[PDB]
Amino acid sequence: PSFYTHTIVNITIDLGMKRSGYGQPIASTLSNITLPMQDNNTDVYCIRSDQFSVYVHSTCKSSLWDNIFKRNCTDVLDATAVIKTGTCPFSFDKLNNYLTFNKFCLSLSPVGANCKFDVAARTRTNEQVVRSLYVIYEEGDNIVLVPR
């Protein structure tokens, strides 16, 4: 569709991984996710735009006796960060038509948030929620979300 400005948001989700005694993959809680800065503030990012798209950047690191998140993350232990409808009605994925908002902000802090996104770690073997993406929004028709 058409826009006057189209901010594209790059979200980086560095997920850390360990594996259990029986070779079961385990996504470390506090794999890190980072949002773009904005004002005397980074924690939350409101989108000051009439249109925006989101781009997830995943990075996996393995771990052993430590949390020394040094190593490749090969064999099942691999990972691709996936963002999932947590507690809010919208999916953040393609369901044909477009999301519409008068406001939309992603918070690393559960303060005044409307809902959650369950950031998880997809693997061949299973998928596991690691952190939460809090999202403050308002139903409207000013801002428009596109895929992805």
């Epitope: 360990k18 594996r19 259990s20 005694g21 029986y22 079961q24 385990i26 052993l64 299973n126």
Partner: antibody
């Protein structure tokens, strides 16, 4: 009424191969992990690897890769373990044991088989 | 390859005694440790789960304690059927390791 019946004692020459049987009953054979553990006569327990019959997801300890092959006939309720190129140090008693449901990472092994004695001798 | 250590290797006990078995991991494993018993000629069996969790069917005298790197297996009043080998198992870090085991003898 969970039980695991293992195959009889094997007596095998070095360089040959063996395949141990383990028929389960009393629970759903496809929904629980089946682990295999090696016990040496004087020593402790050595985890060999598990297999989830639901598909045939197969894990292995580094020590046992290439030596142990695990299979599971779903409709037979029997789980197998194949060992290749047997040697003196392969001689031991091997247990097959039950684990948790699919996505259980930390389970304790629930029920064990009577064990299978495997002697390698020339 | 986290190494479990059980102490002592052998423990002399008499019926009715209180007893404690020990298992120390190289590194923290939380409560992801299990205890197994194995009578002579027998097959292992889970006594205590996640070192404190009790298992259905196990007699009240068995109990588990610990979190982190130190763990203990307790037998309140020893019975004759308690003569066996006891193995701790670490299930936290790959791969899952067992201890050398602690063996119970009868004292006379």
């Amino acid at each position: 009424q969970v039980q695991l019946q293992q195959s009889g004692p094997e007596l095998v020459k070095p360089g040959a191969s063996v395949k141990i049987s383990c028929k389960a009953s009393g629970y759903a054979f496809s929904s629980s992990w089946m682990n295999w553990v090696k016990q040496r006569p004087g020593q402790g327990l050595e985890w060999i690897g598990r297999i989830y019959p639901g598909d045939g997801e197969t894990n292995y300890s580094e020590k046992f890769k290439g030596k142990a092959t695990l299979t599971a006939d779903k409709s037979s309720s029997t789980a197998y373990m194949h060992l290749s190129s047997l040697t003196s140090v392969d001689s031991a008693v091997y247990f097959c044991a039950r684990g948790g449901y699919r996505y259980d990472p930390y389970y304790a092994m629930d029920y064990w088989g009577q064990g299978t004695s495997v002697t390698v001798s020339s | 390859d986290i190494l479990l250590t059980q102490s002592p290797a052998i423990l002399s006990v008499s019926p009715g005694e209180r007893v404690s078995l020990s298992c120390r991991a190289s590194q923290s494993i939380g409560t992801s440790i299990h205890w197994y018993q194995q009578r002579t000629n027998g097959s292992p069996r889970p006594l205590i789960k996640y070192a404190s969790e009790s298992i259905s069917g196990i007699p009240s005298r068995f109990s588990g304690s610990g979190s982190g790197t130190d763990f203990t297996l307790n037998i309140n009043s020893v019975e004759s059927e308690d003569i066996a080998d006891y193995f701790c198992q670490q299930t936290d870090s790959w791969p899952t390791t067992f201890g050398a085991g602690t063996k119970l003898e009868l004292k006379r």
